[PDB]
Design an enzyme around this catalytic site. Structure first.
Site, PDB file in Angstrom:
ATOM      1  N   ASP A  16       2.452   2.641   7.420  1.00  0.00           N
ATOM      2  CA  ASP A  16       1.271   1.984   6.854  1.00  0.00           C
ATOM      3  C   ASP A  16       0.110   2.250   7.795  1.00  0.00           C
ATOM      4  O   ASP A  16       0.045   1.671   8.886  1.00  0.00           O
ATOM      5  CB  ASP A  16       1.477   0.482   6.653  1.00  0.00           C
ATOM      6  CG  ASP A  16       0.294  -0.183   5.974  1.00  0.00           C
ATOM      7  OD1 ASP A  16      -0.748   0.485   5.764  1.00  0.00           O
ATOM      8  OD2 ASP A  16       0.403  -1.384   5.652  1.00  0.00           O
ATOM      9  N   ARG A  22      -0.008   9.008   0.886  1.00  0.00           N
ATOM     10  CA  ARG A  22      -0.801   9.062   2.104  1.00  0.00           C
ATOM     11  C   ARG A  22      -0.222   8.204   3.223  1.00  0.00           C
ATOM     12  O   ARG A  22      -0.588   8.402   4.387  1.00  0.00           O
ATOM     13  CB  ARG A  22      -2.250   8.668   1.819  1.00  0.00           C
ATOM     14  CG  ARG A  22      -2.385   7.269   1.291  1.00  0.00           C
ATOM     15  CD  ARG A  22      -3.828   6.896   0.980  1.00  0.00           C
ATOM     16  NE  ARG A  22      -3.845   5.613   0.290  1.00  0.00           N
ATOM     17  CZ  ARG A  22      -3.679   5.467  -1.020  1.00  0.00           C
ATOM     18  NH1 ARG A  22      -3.512   6.530  -1.803  1.00  0.00           N
ATOM     19  NH2 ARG A  22      -3.684   4.253  -1.550  1.00  0.00           N
ATOM     20  N   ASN A  23       0.669   7.263   2.904  1.00  0.00           N
ATOM     21  CA  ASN A  23       1.293   6.396   3.899  1.00  0.00           C
ATOM     22  C   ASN A  23       2.725   6.805   4.215  1.00  0.00           C
ATOM     23  O   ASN A  23       3.501   5.982   4.719  1.00  0.00           O
ATOM     24  CB  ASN A  23       1.228   4.932   3.466  1.00  0.00           C
ATOM     25  CG  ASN A  23      -0.090   4.293   3.799  1.00  0.00           C
ATOM     26  OD1 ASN A  23      -0.684   4.551   4.841  1.00  0.00           O
ATOM     27  ND2 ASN A  23      -0.562   3.442   2.906  1.00  0.00           N
ATOM     28  N   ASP A  43       0.837  -1.194   0.000  1.00  0.00           N
ATOM     29  CA  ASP A  43       0.000   0.000   0.000  1.00  0.00           C
ATOM     30  C   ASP A  43       0.874   1.246   0.000  1.00  0.00           C
ATOM     31  O   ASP A  43       0.577   2.243   0.666  1.00  0.00           O
ATOM     32  CB  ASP A  43      -1.012   0.016   1.146  1.00  0.00           C
ATOM     33  CG  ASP A  43      -2.077   1.089   0.974  1.00  0.00           C
ATOM     34  OD1 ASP A  43      -2.313   1.526  -0.173  1.00  0.00           O
ATOM     35  OD2 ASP A  43      -2.663   1.505   1.996  1.00  0.00           O
TER      36      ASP A  43
HETATM   37  C1  LIG Z   1       0.171   4.435  15.691  1.00  0.00           C
HETATM   38  C2  LIG Z   1       0.685   3.804  14.545  1.00  0.00           C
HETATM   39  C3  LIG Z   1       0.608   2.413  14.397  1.00  0.00           C
HETATM   40  C4  LIG Z   1       1.123   1.773  13.262  1.00  0.00           C
HETATM   41  C5  LIG Z   1       1.705   2.515  12.228  1.00  0.00           C
HETATM   42  C6  LIG Z   1       2.302   1.950  11.076  1.00  0.00           C
HETATM   43  O1  LIG Z   1       2.852   2.688  10.257  1.00  0.00           O
HETATM   44  N1  LIG Z   1       2.378   0.590  11.016  1.00  0.00           N
HETATM   45  C7  LIG Z   1       3.051  -0.112  10.055  1.00  0.00           C
HETATM   46  C8  LIG Z   1       2.638  -1.424   9.804  1.00  0.00           C
HETATM   47  C9  LIG Z   1       3.295  -2.219   8.871  1.00  0.00           C
HETATM   48  C10 LIG Z   1       4.392  -1.740   8.164  1.00  0.00           C
HETATM   49  C11 LIG Z   1       4.849  -0.443   8.409  1.00  0.00           C
HETATM   50  C12 LIG Z   1       5.955   0.079   7.686  1.00  0.00           C
HETATM   51  F1  LIG Z   1       6.751   0.775   8.435  1.00  0.00           F
HETATM   52  F2  LIG Z   1       6.639  -0.877   7.103  1.00  0.00           F
HETATM   53  F3  LIG Z   1       5.558   0.891   6.732  1.00  0.00           F
HETATM   54  C13 LIG Z   1       4.178   0.351   9.359  1.00  0.00           C
HETATM   55  C14 LIG Z   1       1.773   3.905  12.385  1.00  0.00           C
HETATM   56  C15 LIG Z   1       1.261   4.552  13.516  1.00  0.00           C
HETATM   57  N2  LIG Z   1       1.389   5.891  13.699  1.00  0.00           N
HETATM   58  C16 LIG Z   1       0.641   6.844  13.157  1.00  0.00           C
HETATM   59  N3  LIG Z   1      -0.572   6.604  12.666  1.00  0.00           N
HETATM   60  C17 LIG Z   1      -1.257   7.629  12.143  1.00  0.00           C
HETATM   61  N4  LIG Z   1      -2.452   7.377  11.622  1.00  0.00           N
HETATM   62  C18 LIG Z   1      -3.038   6.027  11.750  1.00  0.00           C
HETATM   63  C19 LIG Z   1      -4.552   6.034  11.700  1.00  0.00           C
HETATM   64  C20 LIG Z   1      -5.038   6.870  10.544  1.00  0.00           C
HETATM   65  O2  LIG Z   1      -6.473   6.821  10.533  1.00  0.00           O
HETATM   66  C21 LIG Z   1      -4.589   8.305  10.740  1.00  0.00           C
HETATM   67  C22 LIG Z   1      -3.076   8.386  10.744  1.00  0.00           C
HETATM   68  N5  LIG Z   1      -0.741   8.873  12.100  1.00  0.00           N
HETATM   69  C23 LIG Z   1       0.470   9.090  12.610  1.00  0.00           C
HETATM   70  N6  LIG Z   1       1.006  10.317  12.597  1.00  0.00           N
HETATM   71  C24 LIG Z   1       0.404  11.437  12.186  1.00  0.00           C
HETATM   72  C25 LIG Z   1       1.268  12.434  12.340  1.00  0.00           C
HETATM   73  N7  LIG Z   1       2.397  11.947  12.843  1.00  0.00           N
HETATM   74  C26 LIG Z   1       2.233  10.639  13.009  1.00  0.00           C
HETATM   75  N8  LIG Z   1       1.166   8.080  13.132  1.00  0.00           N
END
Ligand SMILES: Cc1ccc(C(=O)Nc2cccc(C(F)(F)F)c2)cc1Nc1nc(N2CCC(O)CC2)nc(-n2ccnc2)n1
Length: 275
Positions: free
Chosen positions: A154, A140-141, A136
Site C-alpha cells: 500500500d 499500482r499497489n 486501495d
Molecule cells: C517503504 C514502504 C513503506 C510502506 C509500504 C507499504 O506497502 N505499507 C503498507 C501499509 C499498509 C498495508 C500494507 C499491506 F501490506 F497490507 F498491503 C502495506 C511499502 C514501502 N515500500 C515501498 N514503497 C514504494 N513506494 C512508496 C512511495 C510511492 O510514492 C512510490 C513507491 N516503492 C517500493 N518499491 C518500489 C520498488 N520496489 C519496492 N517499496
C-alpha cells in the site's frame, strides 16, 4: 508493543540513495541495508511530524511486521529510536505491477497471468483473515519480484474505478469491497494494464455500474477467469465470493490448466471486412 513483530534497525546500517516518492510527512527513498548489501525502500518521518502522524507511522510499521506471507510486501525493519524514523521494506527491480504489465504487453502466457492473480488472491485472503481491510487494492499497489511473485503493498493514494459501490456510497469498506477491487485487478492483469472503463469519467463510471453495466471481457481471456471477475462485481456485497473461494477457484484452474483453454467471446469494437 505496537512494534512487537518488527526488527529494530540501527541507522548506521541504512544508506539512502534516490527519492522514489513521498510519504505523509517525509520522503520515500531507494537505499541499501547492511546486515552483501540488500536493496531496500525506505519511508521516513521527518522533523515536525504531528502526534497523529507518529501514531499512524508506527502503526503502519507494526501491522507490516505482523504480516508474514509470500504475497505481502516484506518489512525488513523499522527505525524508531532515532530520527528520522524509518520503515524499511524489500525492493523489487521489476517495480509495480501496473507499469510492469504495460511495459511487457503480450509477453506472458495465460497460465503465468493466472498465477499472478492466484498469488494476489492468497495475499488478500491472508489480509482478510488477519482482519485487515486494504481499501486501495489496485495493480499500482502490487510489486512484482524476479520470480513473477506478486506482493500486495500500500503506497498511499480517490480510486473510484477500483472501489465497490457501498464503499463509494456510504464509506463501507470491508473485505468484500476489497473483493470488488480484486475483480478490477483481475481485469488489469488480463488486459496488461488497461485503464478500467477507458475514458469514462468518474461520474460516468458510477452511473454505468448503478445501471448494471460491467467491464467487458479482455481479449484472449479464459471464460472461467471472466466469470470469476464478474462474480466479484456483484452489486449485493453478500453475493460476492470470499477470498477463500477465489483462491480455491484459481488453484483448481491452475492445477487443471486445460480449463483455461476455453475463452470468453471478445466483443470487437471494430470489424474489418476482408475477402
Ligand atoms: C517503504 C514502504 C513503506 C510502506 C509500504 C507499504 O506497502 N505499507 C503498507 C501499509 C499498509 C498495508 C500494507 C499491506 F501490506 F497490507 F498491503 C502495506 C511499502 C514501502 N515500500 C515501498 N514503497 C514504494 N513506494 C512508496 C512511495 C510511492 O510514492 C512510490 C513507491 N516503492 C517500493 N518499491 C518500489 C520498488 N520496489 C519496492 N517499496
Amino acid at each position: 508493543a505496537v512494534l512487537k513483530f518488527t526488527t529494530e534497525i540501527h541507522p548506521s546500517c541504512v544508506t539512502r540513495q534516490k527519492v522514489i516518492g513521498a510519504g505523509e510527512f517525509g520522503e520515500v527513498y531507494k537505499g541499501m541495508l547492511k546486515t552483501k548489501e540488500v536493496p531496500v525502500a525506505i519511508k521516513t518521518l521527518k522533523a515536525g511530524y504531528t502526534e497523529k502522524q507518529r501514531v499512524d507511522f508506527l502503526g503502519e510499521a507494526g501491522i507490516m511486521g505482523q504480516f508474514s506471507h509470500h504475497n505481502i510486501i516484506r518489512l525488513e525493519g523499522v527505525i524508531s529510536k532515532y530520527k528520522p524514523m524509518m520503515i524499511i521494506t524489500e525492493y523489487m527491480e521489476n517495480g509495480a505491477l501496473d507499469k510492469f504489465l504495460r511495459e511487457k504487453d503480450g509477453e506472458f502466457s495465460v497460465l503465468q497471468l493466472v498465477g499472478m492473480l492466484r498469488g494476489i488472491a492468497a495475499g488478500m485472503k491472508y489480509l482478510a483473515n488477519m482482519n485487515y481491510v486494504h481499501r486501495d487494492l489496485a495493480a499500482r499497489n502490487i510489486l512484482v519480484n524476479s520470480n513473477l511473485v506478486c506482493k500486495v503493498s500500500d503506497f498511499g493514494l480517490i480510486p473510484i474505478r477500483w472501489t465497490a459501490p457501498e464503499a463509494i456510497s456510504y464509506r463501507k469498506f470491508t473485505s468484500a469491497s476489497d473483493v470488488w477491487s480484486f475483480g478490477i485487478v483481475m481485469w488489469e492483469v488480463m488486459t496488461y494494464g488497461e485503464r478500467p472503463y477507458w475514458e469514462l469519467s468518474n461520474h460516468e463510471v458510477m452511473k454505468a455500474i448503478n445501471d448494471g453495466f460491467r467491464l467487458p471481457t479482455p481479449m484472449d481471456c479464459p471464460s472461467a477467469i471472466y466469470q470469476l471477475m464478474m462474480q466479484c462485481w456483484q452489486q449485493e456485497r453478500a453475493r460476492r465470493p470470499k477470498f477463500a473461494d477465489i483462491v480455491s477457484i484459481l488453484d483448481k484452474l491452475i492445477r487443471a490448466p486445460d480449463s483455461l483453454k476455453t475463452l470468453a467471446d471478445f466483443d470487437p469494437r471494430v470489424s474489418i471486412r476482408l475477402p
